[PDB]
Amino acid sequence: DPTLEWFLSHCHIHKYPSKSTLIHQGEKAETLYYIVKGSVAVLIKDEEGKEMILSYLNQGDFIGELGLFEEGQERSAWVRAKTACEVAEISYKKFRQLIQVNPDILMRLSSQMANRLQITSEKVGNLAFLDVTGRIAQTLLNLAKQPDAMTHPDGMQIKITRQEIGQIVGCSRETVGRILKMLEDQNLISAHGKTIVVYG
Amino acid sequence: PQTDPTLEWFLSHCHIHKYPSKSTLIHQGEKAETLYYIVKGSVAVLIKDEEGKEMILSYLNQGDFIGELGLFEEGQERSAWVRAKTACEVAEISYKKFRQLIQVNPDILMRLSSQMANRLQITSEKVGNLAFLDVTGRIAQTLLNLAKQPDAMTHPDGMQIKITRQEIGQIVGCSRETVGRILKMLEDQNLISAHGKTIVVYG
Ligand SMILES: Nc1ncnc2c1ncn2[C@@H]1O[C@@H]2COP(=O)(O)O[C@H]2[C@H]1O
Ligand SMILES: Nc1ncnc2c1ncn2[C@@H]1O[C@@H]2COP(=O)(O)O[C@H]2[C@H]1O
Ligand SMILES: [Cl-]
Ligand SMILES: [Cl-]
Ligand SMILES: [Cl-]
């Protein structure tokens, strides 16, 4: 589409190796990014440096957009490359100029911010009233009904690790372990290495 | 609370409607064709968990856009209910008309997008608190957050807020009973005072 091509023609595409930290929470924001190729993780941390993934972002996603609208904004989160990444970069100053020329580019960015807000809002509603057990159970049941869940003699099989469960619900890997054992004993799931079976 | 030429130009293209306290501005799931802007008053943005329990996702106040999430893609449905907390005065404009205003002066889209960005930050922090903080910490953080809403009073011991235990539970994501037990504890810890329907957050 011509809007994205026009936008990219004003950007400088950079290549970063896997595990690069592209954005550090707390730093001064003066640049907008757009993923041309690759995937990243958006993360927040607690005092002990524990973690919760807010989102994965991929090809076609803007990153670092939240500091664009007000002066002196700081990065709201960490963004770390999951794979090697090809990322277009443009100063906020230049981007603001592009918006006056053709605001459709700001409509595209804002469309992504709107979706992100709806997704993050839904996660608040889904997790707020539950304790860690409730959150883990809901998480597994939700994954069991997604298209990539596979058929199993015992029910629906999902691919997920104790670590990434903990990253979704914001708890330790050990707590996940204990809760998965409990869910097995209640005859709701079966856990086998890096896969879980939710009983139907 | 602070308008500017861009906003008054925008408002000159809108119709301002009044909404009594408790009335619904927006119903979740309805087709979105209208953008709102609060001239006066406050609203609550509500969503429900998988058991049908209602949460207060955010309050919005004078100067806030509402109903913007449906503007960017066709056939979008409202993501939440929005109901008046006080009597409100709200400017309305069709998405069709607003898209034309954007072409006339994109600064109005910058104003709207700025709020969307702020909301994402705020909501992201809330999702992090759900995990990083215990229930006590979540209630304590909500009390602070509420001590900074415009409707917050001054007090010789700190900031005095007006909110029901029910409402604290809907913001935090816990039961009214839990809130009661935690406010008592915080009171005994000399961090707050609960004078009936009022709470004083010490500073
Ligand atoms: N809830 C979220 N969902 C998706 N992306 C996010 C979320 N919160 C922050 N980000 C992204 O992470 C970036 C961190 O830097 P910025 O705050 O400039 O811009 C932020 C967004 O691009
Ligand atoms: N997390 C949030 N913070 C503040 N306001 C929100 C949030 N989620 C939804 N809203 C508002 O509630 C509105 C419901 O209708 P829309 O989805 O059109 O637009 C939505 C936003 O204006
Ligand atoms: Cl509606
Ligand atoms: Cl807890
Ligand atoms: Cl009360």
Neighbours of ion ligand 3 (CB under 5 A): B 26-27, 30
* CA B101–ligand 2 middle distance (angstroms): 21
A42 Cβ inside 6 Å of ligand 1: yes
Q: Are B20 and B85 part of one and the same domain?
A: yes
A79 Cβ inside 6 Å of ligand 1: yes
Name the resolution in angstroms.
Answer: 1.8
Ligand 1 atom with minimal separation from the A76 CA: 17
Q: Which ligand is nearest to the CA of B78?
A: 2
Do B55 and A117 make contact, defined as CB atoms within 8 angstroms? no
State the Cα–Cα distance between residues B176 and A112, nearest whole angstrom.
Answer: 36
Do A124 and B121 make contact, defined as CB atoms within 8 angstroms? no
Q: Are B104 and B202 part of one and the same domain?
A: no
Element (H, E) at B112: helix B107-132
- Set of chain B residues whose Cβ sits within 8 Å of the Cβ of A106: 106, 109-110, 113
Residue A1's nearest CA partner among A107, A75, A79 is A107
The residue type found at B100 is Q
Q: What is the CATH number of the domain that holds A119?
A: 2.60.120.10
Residue B71's nearest CA partner among B112, B32, B114 is B32
Name B15's Cβ contacts closer than 8 Å, sequence gap at least 6: B91, B92, B93
A61 Cβ inside 6 Å of ligand 1: no
Identify the DSSP state of A177.
H
Q: Are A185 and A105 part of one and the same domain?
A: no
State the Cα–Cα distance between residues A27 and B43, nearest whole angstrom.
Answer: 33
- Spatial contact of B203 and B148, defined as CB atoms under 8 Å apart: no
Do A54 and B102 make contact, defined as CB atoms within 8 angstroms? no
Helix (H, G, I), strand (E, B) or coil at A18: coil
- Compute the 3-state secondary structure of chain A and give helix, strand, coil in percent, each to the nearest 5: 40, 30, 30
State the Cα–Cα distance between residues B192 and B203, nearest whole angstrom.
Answer: 9
| Other residues' Cβ atoms within 10 Å of the Cβ of residue B81 | 20
- Spatial contact of B18 and B25, defined as CB atoms under 8 Å apart: no
Crossing angle of the two packed helices B135-146 and B165-172, in degrees rounded to 10: 110
B144 is an annotated ligand-binding site residue: no
The strand order across the sheet containing B153-155 reads: B153-155, B158-162, B198-202, B192-195
Residue B97's nearest CA partner among B190, B197, B14, B159 is B14
B46 Cβ inside 6 Å of ligand 2: no
- Set of chain B residues whose Cβ sits within 8 Å of the Cβ of A62: none
Crossing angle of the two packed helices A132-144 and A162-169, in degrees rounded to 10: 110
- Set of chain B residues whose Cβ sits within 8 Å of the Cβ of A114: 68-69, 71-72, 116
- Spatial contact of A169 and B131, defined as CB atoms under 8 Å apart: yes
Q: A119-149 in b/e burial notation, b at 16+ Cβ within 10 A?
A: ebbbbbbbbbbbebebbbbbbbeebbeeeeb
State the Cα–Cα distance between residues A45 and B124, nearest whole angstrom.
Answer: 12
| Other residues' Cβ atoms within 10 Å of the Cβ of residue A198 | 22
User: How far out from the chain centre does Cα A52 lie?
Assistant: 9
Choose the closest CB to B106 out of A77, A100, A171: A100
List the domain range (segments joined by +) for residue A138.
Answer: 131-200
CA atoms within 13 A on the CB side of B180: 5
The strand order across the sheet containing A189-192 reads: A150-152, A155-159, A195-199, A189-192
The residue type found at A141 is L
Pairing label, strands B54-61, B153-155: unpaired
Q: Are A109 and A183 part of one and the same domain?
A: no
Pairing label, strands B24-26, B81-84: antiparallel
Helix (H, G, I), strand (E, B) or coil at B81: strand
Q: Are A37 and A91 part of one and the same domain?
A: yes
Q: Are A65 and A108 part of one and the same domain?
A: yes
State the Cα–Cα distance between residues A91 and A146, nearest whole angstrom.
Answer: 38
Q: Are B65 and B126 part of one and the same domain?
A: yes
Helix (H, G, I), strand (E, B) or coil at B62: coil
Q: What is the CATH number of the domain that holds A169?
A: 1.10.10.10
Crossing angle of the two packed helices B165-172 and B176-188, in degrees rounded to 10: 100
Place of tokens 């005092």: A47
Place of tokens 């076609």: A60
User: What sections of chain A are H helices per DSSP?
Assistant: 2-8, 92-101, 104-127, 132-144, 162-169, 173-185
The residue type found at A148 is D
Element (H, E) at B8: helix B5-11
Element (H, E) at B117: helix B107-132
Q: Are A187 and A123 part of one and the same domain?
A: no
Residue B104: is it exposed, middle or buried by C-beta count within 10 angstroms (0-12/13-18/19+)? exposed
State the Cα–Cα distance between residues A26 and B188, nearest whole angstrom.
Answer: 36
B71 Cβ inside 6 Å of ligand 2: no
- Spatial contact of B161 and B153, defined as CB atoms under 8 Å apart: yes
Choose the closest CB to B128 out of A44, A70, A126: A44
Q: Are B111 and B188 part of one and the same domain?
A: no
Q: Of A130, A156, A182, which marks where a domain is finished?
A: A130
Q: Of B133, B154, B170, which marks where a domain is finished?
A: B133
Q: Are A146 and A91 part of one and the same domain?
A: no
What is the maximal distance between C-alpha atoms in chain B? Answer: 58
- Spatial contact of A72 and A11, defined as CB atoms under 8 Å apart: no
B175 is an annotated ligand-binding site residue: no
Cα Rg of chain A (Å, integer)? 20
State the Cα–Cα distance between residues B118 and A68, nearest whole angstrom.
Answer: 11
Q: Are B95 and B183 part of one and the same domain?
A: no
- Set of chain A residues whose Cβ sits within 8 Å of the Cβ of B117: 65-66, 68-69, 113
Q: Which ligand is nearest to the CA of A64?
A: 1
| Ligand 2: residue whose CA is nearest its atom 12 | B80
State the Cα–Cα distance between residues B200 and B203, nearest whole angstrom.
Answer: 9
Chain B positions contacting chain A at CB under 8 Å are 47-51, 53, 55, 57, 68-69, 71-73, 79-80, 102-103, 106, 109-110, 112-114, 116-117, 119-121, 123-128, 130-132, 172-174
Domain count, chain B: 2
The residue type found at A122 is E
Residue B143's nearest CA partner among B119, B172, B166, B176 is B172
Q: Are B63 and B32 part of one and the same domain?
A: yes
- Spatial contact of B84 and A164, defined as CB atoms under 8 Å apart: no
Ligand 2 atom with minimal separation from the B71 CA: 18
Residue/partner pairs of A175-181 with CB below 8 Å, 24 or more apart: A175/A132, A176/A136, A179/A132, A179/A133, A179/A136, A180/A136
Residue A68's nearest CA partner among A110, A25, A116, A121 is A110
Q: Of A97, A130, A163, which marks where a domain is finished?
A: A130
Name A79's Cβ contacts closer than 8 Å, sequence gap at least 6: A21, A22, A23, A40, A41, A42, A43, A57, A63, A64
Residue B32's nearest CA partner among B66, B75, B83 is B75
